[PDB]
Amino acid sequence: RTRLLDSEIKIMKSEVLRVTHELQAMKDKIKENSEKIKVNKTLPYLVSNV
Amino acid sequence: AVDTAEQVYISSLALLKMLKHGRAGVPMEVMGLMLGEFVDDYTVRVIDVFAMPQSGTG
Incomplete structure (x- = not known):
């Protein structure tokens, strides 16, 4: 009766690594999408041609 | 209430980080x-x- 113990420690690790999934999403998205809004809100961002 | 000619004794690490x-x-x-x-x-x-962090906004 210990496979559930390893799987529940892995489920606590799943909540931890899912807080880390949400961290690598949202906390990194703070930097990323904040400065990407800010680079989109620099100017009428200098239209151009490839 | 009084003004004197100041001076900046720099740690060199100041200009190194600059x-x-x-x-x-x-x-x-x-x-x-x-x-x-x-x-x-x-x-x-x-x-x-x-x-500082990369404050590339302005």
């Missing part, structure tokens, strides 16, 4: 804060110039 911050400080202008101690009226010192 040269790293300008060399790696890609020519978009950037901002930070200076950290020393106000010793007296006719002199000041800067013992530290710390680093």
Whole structure:
């Protein structure tokens, strides 16, 4: 009766690594999408041609 | 209530972090804060110039 113990420690690790999934999403998205809004809100961002 | 000619006894690490911050400080202008101690009226010192995150917005 210990496979559930390893799987529940892995489920606590799943909540931890899912807080880390949400961290690598949202906390990194703070930097990323904040400065990407800010680079989109620099100017009428200098239209151009490839 | 009185004005004297000041002086800045620099730690060299100040200018070292400024040269790293300008060399790696890609020519978009950037901002930070200076950290020393106000010793007296006719002199000041800067013992530290710390680093900033990549504030590339303005």
